[PDB]
């Protein structure tokens, strides 16, 4: 068994973490267990604290706007490890007890209970080279030695490790995605009828996505092209929450549909990161540091939870758009569009033990 | 004499201060920080516009003291066009910076994609082109007359003077005084209410004081000249020493804003302050065993 | 603004 | 669930060759494709790798500039273009598959195709008796089939692996102990029947 | 670059015995060590990954472990189908480097070769002497010159008597032989 360790620049206090990936179950989040190793000789009268904070970054690292920091703290938890606080009566995890047994008597445990229904670790892709710091939600465990919390702490006396709060695909598949849209232009005849569906709701990263398109064009308007695209929606929730949109994959076929006819076809799409390196603000999965990441997994939320959850909430949809040729007595190059949306889930399969 | 040299001294000191500050900020921006952000481009554009606008102070000053324009017709047109073009350019650059900060604070999600430096360059070029719609026509009507005893540089109208001159006056009043102040005050008010909608309290108070002082200096510098121009257009005024010191003082304050803009937008920026000061330890994450 |  | 390799054969020093690895049951974006070669009588050496999810592409330090790996995602196939094939490139090239996300070793490996870059050509095996077995020399290229009495005493014969001689052409030997030995060379269609 | 030292290069065990294969890494790889098994004439097959996790379908008798930069593959009960060549890879950094390879063979009693000498046939010198060692054990063996460079070839372990075979050939001149 191996555990992660990090030491302060002065090398006096070091903190031990069993793992750096914490699974976010909908009902509860896995506890953040760890042990900090200190020494009474260095700390004459100070008390060491461990703080777990959730940092959300609004914009670029440089302020350049009245000198204010675009960095919100969505959740901050604090605990006094040494001396052992008689206030908290939390038990000891088996990993924590093993760490205490392995380390000396100068090792003290800390545990964090992350409340449920919080944003996961998501980082926004900066696209072209503009900034040196990432932008997004992340979690970090910091342990520092100080006299009291309301005090500036030197960077030489504090450790800090980024941790990931991740979610995995649900063990059971859901209802098959399906969308329908009927449209008539000038009440000529029976309306155009578009039907689209996906083979399954939950897809994993790198798997192809099969879109079953079925069109019965009963009107007199010919369909020029059919465009299938996968779009990533990032609910960047804040004061006056907004919506970010980005086409991750696309396929614009030239399959025409004649009036009073039908056309059924299956289009296979695959969202991957090779062709999406130039899209600024694309939600990534948010690893520890600059490393191999992928498209951010769809955020799972409780159906009976609060809607105004700050951070980034990632979701994916498949848009099937038919561009119909427009023109009657006067022949122009204008066109109309009939589109449907098929929401699906993009996650990682649960690791097998 | 005593009452005819104070105006000259005031104009000279305002001009030299403006050019000194503008040249300093231009050199620092172009040499040290190297214009790698949208804001840096915005302050650089403001500095260029303000320096160009203030560079015409010696010409007007020597026209005042001599009572004539000894340069010539070409310089007459050049100075008129420069003054009008760069005054509009400065005010409109202020407006664009105000709306940029409003978008940055009120809509950070939209600012993440709407503050690309290419977009800033496009905005500044569009501003300089839009300000040209008065810079060229004034150059197309800036010939000089041999006035009896003077060669004064004025604006020519081949159509009814009392109509087109008042039209230009009111157009400058509406498109350079009231709409810009409206844009600035709305943007900064939306910013301050968004900030107050939430150590942070002291920073918020500092930001409120900064936006308030910017608005106050703009609305204190630019309103007296426009108000007095309107009053002069409406009713004739007798000429006295108080008249000839006030008329000029209003202009001096109007260029004081041009000087203060660099004194505020640049010399208080954090990155600019760091560059000006220049001009004048983390372990790695490893692993360890765990006996069973 | 005005030319004096 | 299957990896099929093809495009290997005799090449001359400096020539070119292109190997194809068709992946059935795998997605080219959810899995990375690796090429591992095994020299005759040696260990495994990684050659190249491609990650279609990221567009990344890696090569060994001994194959950079010469070897080129690509992938056609439509057919779920990976190609390895090999230019300037030096004599040290004689090996059996395996195409392997690993999980693109959270790499967990080479789960699936292909049967592998032998790539021989010998500068020699097809030659005939010269049969010399040993007064009891027979020895074949200059039998290029591999393989060489040998049998005693046309397959009668097949149980009690020991055949040694072919060793590349200094001339480049391989050689093989066989022995039987208490007749006639028959040898068939498939790459040249030459059958020789000798009696010790 | 990381070089993995797999030892021993070759071992001889019997059915039911316990076999340990050692793998040492030059640098420090966290857990990115995989063990593969390759039989003669067949592609390698992954056995363990992450230096401790058993791959699906692999018999439970195979077990891996780590102690710092020293990785070990253990077979609790050697089976006749579990005698092949085992490699040790490290996928922590690119390039991925494999081990030298440990070859497992069946253990039997010591056997003595029946040395034979065959002079070159007249149909060839119109020129290569050979020394032939048949049915010897263990694999290690030497040769003695008796009448340029000599080439030696060794076969795989015999399926019948679990023995080996060796033949060393050398081309001579017409001075000593004639």
Residue numbers in the entry:
A (entry chain C): 6 to 358
B (entry chain R): 65 to 262, 270 to 351, 363 to 374
C (entry chain P): 1 to 4
D (entry chain H): 5 to 135, 148 to 194, 204 to 221
E (entry chain L): 2 to 127, 131 to 151, 158 to 188
Can I see the authors' text?
Activation of the μ-opioid receptor (μOR) alleviates pain but also elicits adverse effects through diverse G proteins and β-arrestins. The μOR is the primary target of opioid drugs used in the management of pain, acute pulmonary edema, cough, diarrhea, and shivering. Here, we present the cryo-EM structures of the μOR–Gz and μOR–βarr1 complexes, revealing selective conformational preferences of μOR when engaged with specific downstream signaling transducers. Integrated receptor pharmacology, including high-resolution structural analysis, cell signaling assays, and molecular dynamics simulations, demonstrated that transmembrane helix 1 (TM1) acts as an allosteric regulator of μOR signaling bias through differential stabilization of the Gi-, Gz-, and βarr1-bound states.
Finally, 2.8-Å maps for the DAMGO-bound μOR–βarr1–Fab30 complex and the endomorphin-1-bound μOR–βarr1–Fab30 complex were obtained by cryo-EM. Notably, both μOR and βarr1 adopt active conformations in the μOR–βarr1 complex. For the βarr1-coupled µOR, the most evident changes compared to the Gi-bound µOR are a 3.0-Å upward displacement of helix8, a 1.3-Å outward movement of the TM7–helix8 hinge in the cytoplasm, and a 1.1-Å net inward displacement of the entire TM1 segment; the TM1 inward displacement is 0.7 Å relative to the µOR bound to Gz. These three changes — upward displacement of helix8, outward movement of the TM7–helix8 hinge, and inward displacement of TM1 — are also observed in the endomorphin-1–µOR–βarr1 and –Gz complexes relative to the endomorphin-1–µOR–Gi complex. The insertion of the fourth residue phenylalanine (Phe4) of endomorphin-1 into the pocket formed by TMs 1, 2, and 7 results in a 0.4-Å inward movement of TM1 in the endomorphin-1–µOR–βarr1 complex compared to the endomorphin-1–µOR–Gi complex, which is slightly less significant than that observed between the DAMGO–µOR–βarr1 and DAMGO–µOR–Gi complexes. In the endomorphin-1–µOR–βarr1 complex, the B-factor of TM1 is similar to other transmembrane segments, whereas it is significantly higher in the endomorphin-1–µOR–Gz complex. The different conformation of endomorphin-1 also leads to an upward shift of W2936.48 in µOR compared to the endomorphin-1–µOR–Gi complex.
